[PDB]
Design a protein around this nucleic acid. Structure first.
Ligand SMILES: [Mg+2]
Ligand SMILES: [Mg+2]
Ligand SMILES: [Mg+2]
Length: 92
RNA sequence: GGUCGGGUCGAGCCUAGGCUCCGUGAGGGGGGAGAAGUCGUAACAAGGUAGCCGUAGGGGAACCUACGGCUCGAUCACCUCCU
């Protein structure tokens, strides 16, 4: 239901680097080493290959970012019906 | 007081050599935190091959093997020496 705002955009989880760090491919072609904020790190489990909202850092907004929201399967289908996400983006 | 000659002292300046300090720096090396991406299970009980010290060789990694040593080693049988 929430949508990206400003620098926020859609991303796909690619690899888990441990220590609360993730690898996420964005919808423009940049692989970013993102950090999981503690507020949502203690509530929601996240696996490899999920759609999330990536907010770039105010400094060096090219390789580092944060993950601020994750969607569910029903939300993924709803976005697919709306026309905001495509099969190519899911499959990379 | 000017000019020339002689003797002596002399800050500074140039060249060469030798030590030493500060700023960068391609590349290499371990150390400390973090939390988990990964492969195993070396230690604590006889931890499932008792553990550890010295020296030497080998192995993805904890580690393994040989010679001499210590008890900071468990259980059973026998023997020895004491109170
Ligand atoms: Mg063991
Ligand atoms: Mg052992
Ligand atoms: Mg060997």
């Amino acid at each position: 239901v929430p949508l990206p705002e400003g620098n926020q955009l859609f991303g796909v989880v690619e690899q888990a680097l441990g220590a609360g760090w993730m690898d996420v491919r964005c919808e423009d072609g940049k692989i970013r080493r993102c950090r999981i904020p503690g507020k949502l790190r203690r509530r929601v489990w996240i696996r490899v290959g999920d759609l999330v909202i990536v907010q770039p850092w105010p400094v060096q907004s090219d390789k580092r970012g944060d993950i601020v929201y994750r969607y569910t399967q029903t939300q993924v289908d709803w976005l697919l019906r709306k026309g905001k996400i495509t099969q190519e983006f899911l499959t990379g």
